[PDB]
Amino acid sequence: LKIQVHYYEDGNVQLVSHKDVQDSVTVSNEAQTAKEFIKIIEHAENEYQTAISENYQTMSDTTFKALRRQLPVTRTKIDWNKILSYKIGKEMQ
Amino acid sequence: IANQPVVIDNGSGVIKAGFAGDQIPKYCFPNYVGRPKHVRVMAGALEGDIFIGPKAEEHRGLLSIRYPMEHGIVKDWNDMERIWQYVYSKDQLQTFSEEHPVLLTEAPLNPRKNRERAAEVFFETFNVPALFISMQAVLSLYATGRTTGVVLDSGDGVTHAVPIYEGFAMPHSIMRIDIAGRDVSRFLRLYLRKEGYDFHSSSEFEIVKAIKERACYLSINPQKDETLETEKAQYYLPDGSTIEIGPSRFRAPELLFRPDLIGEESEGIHEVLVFAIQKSDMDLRRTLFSNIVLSGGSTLFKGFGDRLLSEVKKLAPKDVKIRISAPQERLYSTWIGGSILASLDTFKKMWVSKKEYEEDGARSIHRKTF
Amino acid sequence: IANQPVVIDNGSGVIKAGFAGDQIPKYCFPNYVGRPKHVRVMAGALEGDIFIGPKAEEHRGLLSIRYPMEHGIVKDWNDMERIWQYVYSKDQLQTFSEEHPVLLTEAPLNPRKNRERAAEVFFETFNVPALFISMQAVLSLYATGRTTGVVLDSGDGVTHAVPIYEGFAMPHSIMRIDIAGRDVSRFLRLYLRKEGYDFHSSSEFEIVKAIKERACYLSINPQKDETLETEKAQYYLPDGSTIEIGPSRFRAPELLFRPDLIGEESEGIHEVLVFAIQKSDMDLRRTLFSNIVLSGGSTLFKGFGDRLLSEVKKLAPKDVKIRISAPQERLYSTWIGGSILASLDTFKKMWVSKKEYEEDGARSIHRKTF
Ligand SMILES: Nc1ncnc2c1ncn2[C@@H]1O[C@H](COP(=O)(O)OP(=O)(O)O)[C@@H](O)[C@H]1O
């Protein structure tokens, strides 16, 4: 299920993915299993696109904050004045 | 000169005071204000009408003692100065404000008018040149050595479950519902009203608090132990008489976890702390589930923390590492933690100097306290 | 069905309801669940006790009022059904579900589960034969008559910028945040918690929300108006209790622009709106610049849209003609459009019949919603 998204304005977005899948349908007849095989492809497409849609949210928070946090651990504010003042926590922490 | 600083722990029920470096605040007495009752005509009595310590404990029912700090709200400012003066006296400090630095304590959500009012005291009436004031929870962290812990104090009318991480209490997660054993003992006086006894005098109520701190505990089973018939243990009256106890010793502290008994829309310390847990990093919660920092004087009951453990079990899910870290010298743990903090040398900056206070006062504090 | 169609203005903070043709919702009372606080003793004490409306506003101090629509999502489902029965009662509807056509409205980015559960109510408990769950932003466009507009709601637990095109928004360029004046006013109370005001009841907090709607605004200059010292204008409670206001009135709504005051993983609803507009074509963005629609109730602050204008000027590029429509029934704009669409008899195809539910449940709604 090869993908090649190429957005580039103000930050390159060269998104590429796929979905290596292998199913095994039974061949009875042409028109009988034709739509069945297409249905398998269809569901893998719908499912993977759905998975990617969910991946937007899960990566949006999980992957993001996992690599670069959104807010700090306290999530409040970073005041470097008080941070440099007294050596704000390297004493015990 | 920055002499030996004085770690002054302003605990809700009991205020503590002593020089840093020490392990015991040699000058302690509870947090009260004692004015007399009668009029001494003949001599042989003390003078001043503000009797603290051995005078107060001596002339308990002779003095109509009162309490300034009301859930962290103190109003006897002038008399507070006299209390400090009583400590400043030959009895306790024997020194001057200018001579020795002062490490005073605080609680969250306090009105800056009162905080800066205290600065007016120690910089105008008293003239402390090196005064720094801060929370007591961090002091308890110095005592435990832990840095990522949820501190909940237990005084007489103050209970703030503050979750701290590496010495950085998340204000969005800080919980301050300062109410404790004050009204619990008052409700126990209501039990005595439902037994025929009044303790309307503070000293009369002091005995109630003495037995409260003495003959009370936490029956982990709330309604199970509540519905069972008590034995009504006859406890000695100070004169020499004796009176029963009943469920009160465990029934009255149920109000701490069940605030609806007094009719208060609260949730019980444990749930409030779980709410503080909810406002943090999920992974840090597991540490904090095991980083149970106990603090305050009211953490002295049988099955206290264990009933609290049952609360956590009703709150926390499975496979959650729970670990109580109870201290022993609870109120002094914060005092010794202040002795640790005041011993720091980088510590000289954020304390408002006398000239610093002369500069702006209010905003100089605002910016130096934040 | 040949009856006047019911319009349901699903307001987060203040929910409303009404019919077709009308311009103001026929029956208005906010979204809340007022549970009791005491036990009946005297014959005359009402029963059911989970009262709404006159009894609620009347006996605020006697009803433990809670809120189901948390984050714009109802949690007290069954109770909200009964609130609709309260509407179905002699007070508001005086009719049945099966009689009048009904029209439900919605916010963007809503979970399907809520819509499904609502349909369960609508066709199982309630049995409306003519009903469909519509949107809210397009209804405000019906009110304005505009086509390519950005709709910004302003409730209590929901905030969404909906870039619409002729009443058909890009269901992707829309942004939605579930927070407004609820916790903002709670944070304002938190400002007062510092200065001693932790008056915890929701009805007690309803007064704080009356101040939110009354004594609050948005100062365009952030630090130039916040860091300075105010005059602290006073407020008087239902009895007339003197309480100063101060800077808090504009300090607290900065949370909507600076989520760091609460630590929310948002980035200022203004920037989120900018991003909602920026998820479309530049010329389409121009059309949206020309049509900026406001909804909800929190759009009633001084310097609200003005500070928003300043933020857009400091963030959006040049030539952005910020044409913000400022109507008055921003709360009812969604209701107005619901009455407009309710007047549109084309809804036959747009609705979901009872048998349509019998054959599809909510799948029919999900196939027809946009
Ligand atoms: N054994 C005890 N049982 C109950 N409460 C106690 C006991 N010992 C001390 N306390 C409470 O703690 C108060 C003093 O603690 P305090 O210094 O006020 O703690 P905090 O700093 O937590 O406010 C006393 O007034 C009392 O109510």
Ligand SMILES: Nc1ncnc2c1ncn2[C@@H]1O[C@H](COP(=O)(O)OP(=O)(O)O)[C@@H](O)[C@H]1O
């Ligand atoms: N005059 C006002 N000033 C400021 N805020 C207001 C005013 N009137 C209402 N609000 C806010 O709008 C909210 C009403 O919610 P509502 O807008 O009905 O939700 P929705 O956005 O879903 O319609 C209230 O909670 C209140 O905080």
